[PDB]
Design a protein around this ligand. Structure first.
Ligand SMILES: CC(C)(NC(=O)c1c(O)c2ccccc2n(OCc2cscn2)c1=O)C(=O)O
Ligand SMILES: [Zn+2]
Length: 340
């Protein structure tokens, strides 16, 4: 019905940031992710318990809030940027290394390296031409990046995020992923194995999250499939015959805007959509390797540990059988008439 709640009113009486007609319609109920300040101890407790929370005042990417297409085009440099195209609004991602195991499936969102000015050229053409094609720039930011953007990076609130890394016992910061998308772009539900600080910069993104214990309801692809860690369920046209427990899924929902930081806990499903008719969206992700597994295991196992266990079983069988395609039949032989 309404998970994000009523839209926030922007300062200076500039009206509603968004309205619900910019959100896509789905079949499952949702509830709000808490919007808190970083000074609120409840926000600290949520991150500690690995629950999602939107922090409204970290100033994490404060110097990046002036970023738009033309400022980035003149300052980001002339490196290569990964640009993904799609004939539809859903951008299904593929592990290209795993595309050898599954030949009978074809990709529908091809990557293309290009210069940043070529991406801005390619985008504005689509708007004048009026085409239905969509693009999504998704590029880890390196040091081939120009002077002013390095200075902007230096202006990030490293004090706040470094102590978050320390107090949680997390591993190191693995990468910063810059993301520029078109309105209506959708990133279908999937989970990551790293802790994520999701720093919104330009435009608005509706984030629908599912806790790890709803693994049964979301049906991820086989670990060896190129779409590993993504849900097989089409949120627009869910197949309740193949995926009956998707009728039981309950999400956590929020809309992040400029200055907001969404903590996506490790192994939490998330479905991200750039608001319809909301313009371009800009986001920077912060990935941290999770804290190492504790000394002695505490029982019962947390849900994300069972997910980790299930991933390792699928990997092990893939190596033991010499062919990832035999994992399925072996698993069915194991349970049919014995555990089901
Ligand atoms: C930012 C985005 C689009 N959300 C995401 O979740 C998301 C991606 O786009 C993505 C795109 C290309 C490659 C990897 C990606 N990963 O995972 C990291 C990974 C891949 S392989 C091992 N680890 C993502 O998580 C949003 O819309 O906000
Ligand atoms: Zn993700």
């Amino acid at each position: 019905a309404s998970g994000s709640g009523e839209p926030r009113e922007e300062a200076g009486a500039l009206g509603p940031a968004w309205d619900e007609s910019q959100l896509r319609s789905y079949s499952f109920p949702t509830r709000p992710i808490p919007r808190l300040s970083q000074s609120d101890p409840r926000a600290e407790e949520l991150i500690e318990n690995e629950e999602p929370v939107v922090l409204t005042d970290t100033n994490l990417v404060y110097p990046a809030l002036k970023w738009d297409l033309e400022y980035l085009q003149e300052n980001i440099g002339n490196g290569d940027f990964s640009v993904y195209s799609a004939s539809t609004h859903k951008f299904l991602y593929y592990d290209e290394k795993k595309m050898a195991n599954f030949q009978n499936f074809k990709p529908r969102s091809n990557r293309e390296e290009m210069k940043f000015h070529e991406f801005v050229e390619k985008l504005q053409d689509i708007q004048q031409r009026g085409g239905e094609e969509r693009l999504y720039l998704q590029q880890t930011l390196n040091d081939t990046v120009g002077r002013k953007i390095v200075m902007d990076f230096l202006g990030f609130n490293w004090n706040w995020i470094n102590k978050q890394q320390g107090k949680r016992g997390w591993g190191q910061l693995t990468s910063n992923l810059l993301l520029i998308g078109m309105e209506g772009n959708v990133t279908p539900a999937h989970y990551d194995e790293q802790q994520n600080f999701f720093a919104q910069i330009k435009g608005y993104k509706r984030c629908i999250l599912f806790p790890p214990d709803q693994f049964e309801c979301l049906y991820p692809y086989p670990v060896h499939h190129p779409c590993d860690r993504q849900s097989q369920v089409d949120f627009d046209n869910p197949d309740y015959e193949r995926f009956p427990n998707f009728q039981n899924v309950v999400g956590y929902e929020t809309v992040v805007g400029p200055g907001d930081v969404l903590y996506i806990p490790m192994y939490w499903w998330h479905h991200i959509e750039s608001l319809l008719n909301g313009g371009i969206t800009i986001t920077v992700n912060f990935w941290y390797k999770g804290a190492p597994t504790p000394k002695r295991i505490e029982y019962p196992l947390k849900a994300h540990q069972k997910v980790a266990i299930m991933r390792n079983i699928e990997k092990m069988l893939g190596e033991a059988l010499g062919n990832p395609q035999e994992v399925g039949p072996l698993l069915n032989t194991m349970i049919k008439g014995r555990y089901n």
